[PDB]
Amino acid sequence: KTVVVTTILESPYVMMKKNHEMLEGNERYEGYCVDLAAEIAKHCGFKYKLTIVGDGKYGARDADTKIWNGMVGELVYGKADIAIAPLTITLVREEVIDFSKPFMSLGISIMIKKGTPIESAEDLSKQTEIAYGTLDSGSTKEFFRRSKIAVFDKMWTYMRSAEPSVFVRTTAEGVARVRKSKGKYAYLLESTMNEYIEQRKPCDTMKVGGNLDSKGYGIATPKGSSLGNAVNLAVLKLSEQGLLDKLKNKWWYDKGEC
Amino acid sequence: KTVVVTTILESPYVMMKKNHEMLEGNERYEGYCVDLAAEIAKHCGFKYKLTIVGDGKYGARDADTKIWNGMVGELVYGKADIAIAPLTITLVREEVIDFSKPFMSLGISIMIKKGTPIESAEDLSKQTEIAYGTLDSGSTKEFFRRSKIAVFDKMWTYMRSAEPSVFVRTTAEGVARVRKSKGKYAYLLESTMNEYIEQRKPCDTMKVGGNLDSKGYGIATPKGSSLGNAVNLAVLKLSEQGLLDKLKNKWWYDKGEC
Ligand SMILES: NS(=O)(=O)c1cc2c(cc1C(F)(F)F)NCNS2(=O)=O
Ligand SMILES: NS(=O)(=O)c1cc2c(cc1C(F)(F)F)NCNS2(=O)=O
Ligand SMILES: N[C@@H](CCC(=O)O)C(=O)O
Ligand SMILES: N[C@@H](CCC(=O)O)C(=O)O
Ligand SMILES: [Zn+2]
Ligand SMILES: [Zn+2]
Secondary structure, eight states, X not given: OOEEEEEOOBTTTBEEOTTGGGOOGGGGEESHHXXXXXXHHHHXXXXXXXXXXXXXXXXXXXXXXXXXXXXXXXXXXXXXXXXXXXXXXXXXHHTXXXXXXXXXXXXXXXXXXXXXXXOSHHHHHTOSSSEEEEBTTSXXXXXXXXXXXXXXXXXXXXXXXXXXXXXXXXXXXXXXXXXHTTTSEEEEEEXXXXXXXXXXXXXXXXXXXXXXXXXXXXXXXXXXXXXXXXXXXXXXXXXXXXXXXXXXXXXXXXXXXX | OOEEEEEOOBTTTBEEOSSGGGXXXXXXXXXXXXXXXXXXXXXXXXXXXXXXXXXXXXXXXXXXXXXXXXXXXXXXXXSOSEEOSSXXXXXXXXXXXXXXXXXXXXXXXXXXETTOSOOSHHHHHTOSSSEEEEBTTSHHHHHHHHOOSHHHHHHHHHHTTOSSOOOBSSHHHHHHHHHHTTTSEXXXXXXXXXXXXXXXXXXXXXXXXXXXXXXXXXXXXXXXXXXXXXXXXXXXXXXXXXXXXXXXXXXXXXXXXX
16 A cells, blocks of 8 residues: 655755656655655655645644644544654654654754844843744744743743734745844744755855754654554664765755855 | 662763762662653652662673673563663664653764864774774664764774774773873763763863764663553653753753863
C-alpha cells in the first residue's frame, strides 16, 4: 500500500518546483522534507505519495469543537499515514499522535527588520511602539498561551488582545509584515525559519536574542501505527550518518543569498 | 514497588554531596539528574532508589560475546528499572532499550588545555604532536568507529592504534589527562560536560570549535516497559513548563567559577 504523506508548503521544507506544472506526483515538490521523505521511505522500504495539508495548518485542537485541524488532524482522522514536515513535538500532540525522535533542533526566536531597537523578549515585553505576534494554530502560539514565565505571560497578555490582530495565518505572511512595517512589527517564529529567511534576499531581516525555548521537529504517525518503529530507527540512522546535517547545509546555507 | 534507578557519577549530573558518608540513600547525591529523577518520579507517582552503575560505564556491546555493559546492560539484564543519566540516544541502543524524547541537547566537542594550537577536528587530524582520544564504552567512541566522514575516519585510524592508549575509563580521567599533559593531549567529549568543566577551577581548559554532531540525552527504560510511556510524557511536560532550562541554569551557570 502506498503511504500517504501529509506535509505543508513551508520554505525551505517543501516548495513547488519552478516547473511543477509539467511534472507529476512527488516530482512537483522540492525541499528539505521532500529529500527526507525519500530517504525515510527508502530505508523503511515503502512507496509514498506527498500531499499538501488542505487547510494549510500545522495543527491545534479547537477549544470549542475539540476538533484537530492541520496535519495533526489529517493523522488523527485517518486522512494520512505519516507527516513529514517541520512539525514541533509537543505534549498535547504526543497525547494523540506518535512522534519519532527529533530530526531537527529549534527554538522560538525573534525576527526583526534590521535596525529595529530590540535585543530580546524582555525588550519587547517592556514596550509598546513595536508590535509583535506569532503564527496562528501553531506550537509557538500555544507556548505563549500556556507559559508561566513572567516575561512570556506579559507578552501573551499583550498579543491576545492587541488590535488589529498581531497573529498571521502563514509564516510568509509574518515575514512580509516585518518587511513592510518599517521596524514597527517583530515576528516570533521558530529559529530554523528565522535563520532561513535571514539568508534570503532582500536581506532586510535578522534574528535577535537567544531562543526562548528548546525543542525539536519529529516525524509523526497515527497513535499505535506500525510505521512508527521503522521510521524512528530510520531517523536515528540518518542522524548518525550525518545526513540531517548535510540536508540543513544544502537548503539553508549552500543556497544563501546574503 | 520502589523503582531502581541506575545512574552514573558524572558532574554535574550526579555528584556526591560534601555531606556524604553521613547521609543515607538518595540523600547522598545531588545534581541535574538527581533533581530530574525527583521531578520525574513526582509526575509519574513512583518511589525510587538511586543506584550508581556498578562498572561505571554508560554502555556498549562487546563485539565478541554480544553482552552489554554499563547502564545499558543494567536495563537489558533486569538489574535496573530505569536509567536517569546523561545517556546518549543512539541507533544501537534504541534496538535494545527504550528512550524518552531528549531532555537535553549536546554534540561531540573538543576540550583543550588553554593555549593549545588547535582550532578544530580538522586541525587535530592534520598533525601528530598533540594526542587525542575519547571515553571508553560510550557513544563518542562509537561515533568515530562508525564515521564515514573523511576527517573523523582519519581521526579514528589514529586513535584506534595509538600507543600508549588515548582512551580513558572515565570523564574525570580524560580531563585530568588534558590538564597535566601541557597541551599535548586533547579530549573529545560531549559539549555539555566540556562546557561545565570550562567554568570550574582551575579554569585551564577550553572548548574549541563547533560541535561535531547533534543529538540528545534521553531517559532509558527496558524494552516494552510500562514506565516508558509515563516517563516520556513527564519529560515533555517538564520541557514545556521550563523546568529543564531552570535545571541547566542551576547546575551549569549559576555555579560558574571562572
Ligand atoms: N539536539 S536535538 O534535541 O534537536 C536532536 C536529538 C536527537 C537526534 C537529532 C537531533 C538534532 F539533529 F535535531 F539536533 N537524532 C536521533 N536521536 S535524538 O537524541 O533524539
Ligand atoms: N533541541 S533538543 O533535540 O536537545 C530537545 C528536543 C525536545 C525537548 C527538549 C530539547 C532540548 F531541551 F534538549 F533542547 N523537549 C520535549 N520534546 S523534544 O522536541 O523531543
Ligand atoms: N512548527 C510549528 C509551527 C510554526 C510556529 O508555530 O511558529 C508547529 O508545529 O506548530
Ligand atoms: N553520553 C555518552 C557518554 C560520554 C561520551 O561517550 O562522551 C554515552 O551515553 O555513551
Ligand atoms: Zn509540574
Ligand atoms: Zn570482549
